[model samples]
Target: SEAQRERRKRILDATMAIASKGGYEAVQMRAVADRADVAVGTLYRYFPSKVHLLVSALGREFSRIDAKTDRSAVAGATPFQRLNFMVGKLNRAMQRNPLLTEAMTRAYVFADASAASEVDQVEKLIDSMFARAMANGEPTEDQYHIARVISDVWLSNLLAWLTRRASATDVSKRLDLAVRLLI
Candidate 1:
């Protein structure tokens, strides 16, 4: 089982490598298969399509945000401050790797119902992160709703930033306004 898991990780690793270097267009099936040292069919068995693969990789990236964030930094802060900390982390991360972020965001936005399971995981992760940021103890229904709304605002801002329609500063200002209005 560990070996199988390792293979899966390698596949994702290969996918990330390709995406980071050349974005979505570079991640051809055969290329990923070869990079991971698996057959194309095997790769297909793990990820039914390129969209699924990239979406899964995007999930991994989100988990890393949780792992890498410093809990101490958010400690004893106001709910709004914690949320701002999380949003700033996400923005910095995306800015650092615009090409990879572009590929993953494109896959996430383009995904249809076929990728629902993976897509849902990404959504849940983001909501959970925001909920934790704002909740005093147990998150209330109201907090959850606002968290989801913030998540929506963040995604739209991300898409805008990716499309060059807004600068990073604009995204932060818009996000700050949303948080100020809702929180």
Candidate 2:
């Protein structure tokens, strides 16, 4: 199982590498297969399509946020502060690599029913991140609903940024208002 896990990690890493370099279109299956040193057939078996691969990579990015964040620091803060910190982290992570972020965001947006399972995982990961951001332990049902709304605003702001429709500052202001009102 460890060996299999390593291969999958490589697959995801390779996809990130390519996507980071040239965005979504550059991620040809053969390129990723060669980059990871896996067979083309194996890559196909691992991810049925580029959208699946990219969305799974998006999930990995959020999972990293989960693993790397200092929960106690967030929990120590007020609810509004905690959410602000998390959303700031999210914005920085996405803006750091504009192309890679755009690629993943676009792939997630364009994914159809075929990628539903992968898409669902990313949504859950995002929700859990927001839920965990709230102070004092487990989020209640209403908090989850609030988390979903916040997440929607986050995604929309990202999409707006991607489309040149909103500046990064615009996103920050909107999210601040959303957090203030919701919390």
Candidate 3:
């Protein structure tokens, strides 16, 4: 299983490399295998489709984001401020790597039932991010519900950029409004 895990990492690493280089256009299965030094058939056993692979890569990003959140203090006096800190982080991450961002976004959009488990994993990772952030104020149940709404809002902001039309600027503007309204 350790070997499988390592191979999976290779596959995801390869996926990210292709995504960062050429966006969604470059993430072909064979290419990922070649880049990973993983066999195509073995890659398939690990990830049945491109969607699974790409979404898993986003999950890896989630892990990275969570790691950052752990090290960095969430700056904000109010829940709004805390939310902005979190929201802005995601926006910056995406904007910095548009091609990879769009690639992951497309994977999220196209995810079929087969990708549901990975999608859920991504969602859980995000919820954990939110919890770490909103912890600044000891938010109540109602506030947590509101945080969930803001997560939806945050996702919408992310999804907006994935449409192949929405710019990073648009995501920022939308994020401000969402944070203003939800937080």
Candidate 4:
């Protein structure tokens, strides 16, 4: 069990290291195996594909991102404004590393049942933040709808940006408007 954890950690860390230095397309399976000092087959056993590897790395990064997004610092006059702030905060961070964002997001979008857990991890991460940002002392049902819509628009905006079809500023504007209109 300890070895399993250590090996996985090594792979994830090494994967990001490669991305940090050379960008996302540089994270080949062979390179990750070599960087982690694990056998190619061993790396395969841990992560069946590069997409799996990158998505997992994204989840780890999400925890760090979410941790820094303090609710109190996100100033807003209403729940809607706070929701917009939350989206902007998340969008701004991901926009800084467009390559990483594109790699992970495309993998996440194309993830199959094999990576169901990893996919769920990302969904939960967004939903948890949604719950926090949408908390307006309203009923749970209302909160759920608001959170889902906000998360949807946020991801759609990112997807648009990833495709080079939308600017980051446009993404932020659309996300803010979606929340404002939805609420």
lDDT: which candidate is best? 1
lDDT of 2 by residue, 1-183 (tens): 897789899999999989889988898889999999999999988888988989999988888877787664266458777888888888888999988998899999899999998899999888878877875468888878888999999999999999999999999999999999998
What does candidate 1's lDDT look like per residue over 1-183, in tens digits?
898899999999999899899998998999999999999999999999999999999999898786676473256469888888877777888889888999999999999999999999999988877877777445788888998999999999999998999998899999999999997
Q: Which model, 2 or 3, shows the larger lDDT?
A: 2
Pick the winner on TM-score between candidates 1 and 2. Answer: 1
TM-score-superior candidate, 1 or 3: 1
lDDT of 4 by residue, 63-172 (tens): 87777875552457777777777777788778787776777787788889889999899887887776676673332777777787778888888899988899977887
Task: For residue 75, give model 4's deviation from the true position in Å.
Answer: 5.4
Clashes of 4: 0
Clashes of each: 0, 0, 0, 0
Ranking by lDDT: 1, 2, 4, 3
**Ten residues in a row with the worst lDDT in model 1?**
68-77
lDDT (tens digit, per residue) of candidate 3 on 1-183: 898888889889999989998999899988999999978898999988989989999999988888777634367766667777887776777788889988998888789887899988988777657656766635567666766777777777777667645777777787788667765
Q: Identify the superior model by lDDT, candidate 2 or candidate 4.
A: 2
Of 1 and 3, the candidate ranking higher by lDDT: 1
Alpha-carbon TM-score of each model against the true structure: 0.94, 0.93, 0.89, 0.88
Clashing residue pairs in candidate 2 are none
**Model 4 reaches what TM-score against the true structure?**
0.88
Model 2, residue 178: distance off in Å is 1.3
Give the number of the best model, judged by TM-score: 1
**After superposing candidate 2, which stretches have Cα over 4 Å from the reference?**
72-76
The residue ranges of model 1 lying beyond 4 angstroms of the native Cα positions read none
